[PDB]
């Protein structure tokens, strides 16, 4: 299975973007949880958000991204994440990881997407 | 809530040697933890889930140890194919946490 | 200033039995009426004090130890009891005071693929002294030739994983257990009911 | 007017433990010496009255309850006991009076193909109060999504069948159990010994 | 000793409905009961043994329910091929009994 | 395997008949119980008798046929049922069914024979 990423392009600071996570070979069933993480070009991994793919998605957020970001499931094989008010420190590679247990939170990430690069520059 | 740290920042040990990486949590996380490996320009790969169990298809050299608040991961022998960055994940309580992942440890195999 | 029973009882994931969690409760009012919505099907059998009159009483210091065990092993959490969990994972002192609570958690800690994240110690040199924790993962030597880190024949890993089978009865289902230890010492009262 | 012990005891087929029978014994003389030929290997450990002096005594009203259980579960038929049979199938009051009898019936209730006609309740919302039979067959919801009559995962049929295995020990063999509930009330004596 | 009665004598519903048939015994018979089906000009065929278990090769539309003195059989969907007669047998105590079988219930599926 | 029955023919009132049930594909082992039942042309099933094919047959009879009927096993694959003094109400189809448990009585009838027609008329 694959979780190829899209919607990654250069954006001027103080604008909005909307990345998409698309599955292949499976659909977002209630068994597994989804998450979005990011990695700066020179730093370590940072967790951004998680959404459940069940009857009642338990959407979570990191403290540093309490309200800036918005993650939502839009179809059976597409989950999108939207950011607003981007700054020069938001440039990074974003990965759409899939969880292995829906305990309302990001558990072990068994499968990862290739990730796409988002850069913020004027 | 739980803030985690990983040490050392960088290591360098010969090909036949052993390397050890320590990861410590602020509050007791019991057995919930996972060690991931990321090679340059690659998505991270799960190595050690549940802090002791090896993942599928991982060589039988990465051994995990410790529980509660302090954990260690050890490679008893490197072979220049294990140069990457290793991360520890709490997967215990993420209601309001800035970052589940710990800091990155860059391992250099001085073959 | 309500006591943090919500955090302890309504935590999403509890600790493994061998590495049980420990929490301190102090300088707060303890309301026991909350322990019906958060913990369904509980069993409040307990020791050292009458459960009903807990409302009008003051406790010196309260410790909360939480973990997850099997359904059939819940009877091993009692003073003087002997068994696997009693000897190698969690020992209660004979002169124990405080109350134990256990409730079924099949709806929270059961996975279709299989729960392989909860572990328990199976081998050990000697029984645990009361209130002690052993997180060592040293390979267990069950024969005569030293293991030297090998896990081959007659050389076993001291920790096993709980294989919950909800197809069977409640005796093969994960039960969440929280043990409260009160006391009475020189310090004045700091935890009381409503 | 001898009491109808033979039909209760020498019955060819006993009830399943969950749907146990209930019989009233009244207006007759009850003899206990016969309960050696009709019931081999009987075990009359019992409560509330001395067995040796049952001959010279009068009982106001007697209830006989009969069923078939496993060999190792016979210890669950006793006041204050906790277990599968005691909680979900047959619960006895703590202040119980009357005597229980159990006898091995491998020769009578074991089939070469396999006995699949004796059933026992395995899932239940809450423990039975003393002397209450639950004949409901409603599907059990062990998860979060409603079953709606489907018997998939986290949706189990509450009743299971006894898989008797006589090749193993007597703990895997069908034992027939008959419980006599005595009493002493305002009514004059009507059931007396020889 | 034990006598049962079966009700109703006859039933009728469109193809989409569910039929329920009741069989009640004079005394408690516990779990010993059997529901048989007989089409005209054919020997009866076992449907429900032990009052809950489906027979071998029987479609999963016949649900048995109840125990003790009252038993019910329910067909959740009729398909014009279930128009037959249904019987209940006590199989509990047959020492001195006039008839183990109960009365006949004739089912008419007006498709 | 089958239990085709024989001996079904018209008998004058106040006479006797002896029907035979023959097994096909097997013989009467001791593990099974045999039974005879009858059905009126437009009424429900009526049970007649049972015989156990073991070392000690537990022959059982219904109340309505306490002394009129008599069932007996005669060979390894043949069990006969004889009635005397057939009346006008004894016309029916008789089935030779096989049990599945030897509890000294008719348990669940797993296998049925085609049954034979017996009519009583002048």
Residue numbers in the entry:
A (entry chain E), F (entry chain G): 1 to 122
B (entry chain D), E (entry chain F): 1 to 111
C (entry chain A), D (entry chain B): 334 to 527
Q: Which of the paper's sentences describe this entry?
A:
Because of the conformational dynamics of the 1H1-bound RBDs, we performed local refinement to improve the resolution of the RBD-1H1 interface. To understand the structural basis of how 1H1 can broadly neutralize all the Omicron sublineages, further local refinement was applied to two adjacent semi-up RBDs of class I to a resolution of 3.52 Å, with one 1H1 Fab bound to each RBD. The improved local densities revealed detailed molecular interactions within the binding interface. RBD residue R346 has extensive interactions with 1H1 VH residues Y103, G104, A105, P106 and D107, and VL residues W32, T91 and Y92, including hydrogen bonds between R346 and the VH Y103, the VL T91 and Y92, and salt bridges between R346 and the VH D107. The R346K mutation is expected to disrupt these interactions, resulting in reduced neutralization against Omicron BA.1.1 compared to BA.1, BA.2 (including BA.2.12.1 and BA.2.75), BA.3 and BA.4/5. Another significant mutation found in Omicron BA.4/5 is L452R, which does not affect 1H1 binding since L452 has no obvious interaction with 1H1. Instead, it may form a new hydrogen bond with VL T53 from 1H1, resulting in no significant change in the neutralization efficiency of 1H1 against BA.4/5 and Delta pseudoviruses compared to BA.1. RBD, the 1H1 epitope does not include any mutation found in BA.1 nor any additional mutation sites found in other Omicron sublineages including BA.2, BA.3, BA.4 and BA.5. Therefore, these Omicron mutations will not directly affect the interactions between the RBD and 1H1.
